């Protein structure tokens, strides 16, 4: 039913068009930390805990 | 009655005059045409139709 067919004298019969689309992405930030004291390092039995 | 006679004395008698006429003509334009298609030539049984 939807085939493009011409005739003997054909003009302005079969017009077509085009389309484009877009994609996107984003970035985020992460992080974490820990704390300690001087006594914890100095008086601990295990050196090199750091 | 209207002959140009003179007398021995002469004088300002028997004066005449002249005239001219003008004629004219103009031009015009004509034309005609015809149309055809490609399949009318390609698929017709008789070559040399044009």
CA A10 to chain centre: 48
Chain A residues at the B interface, defined by Cβ less than 8 Å, are 8-9
DSSP H helix total and E strand total for chain B: 1, 0
B39: chain A residues, CB-CB within 8 Å: 8
Nearest residue of chain B to residue A9 (CA atoms): B37
A8: chain B residues, CB-CB within 8 Å: 37, 39-40
Distance (Å, whole) CA A9 – CA B36: 9
Resolution for this model in angstroms, one decimal place? 3.4
Which token pair is B26?
């103009």
Q: What is the DSSP letter of B42?
A: H
């Amino acid at each position: 039913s939807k085939l493009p067919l011409l005739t003997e004298n054909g003009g302005r019969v079969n017009r077509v068009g085009f389309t484009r689309i877009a994609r996107e992405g984003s970035i985020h930030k992460f992080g974490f930390f820990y704390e300690f004291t001087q006594e914890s390092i100095d008086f601990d039995s295990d050196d090199g805990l750091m």
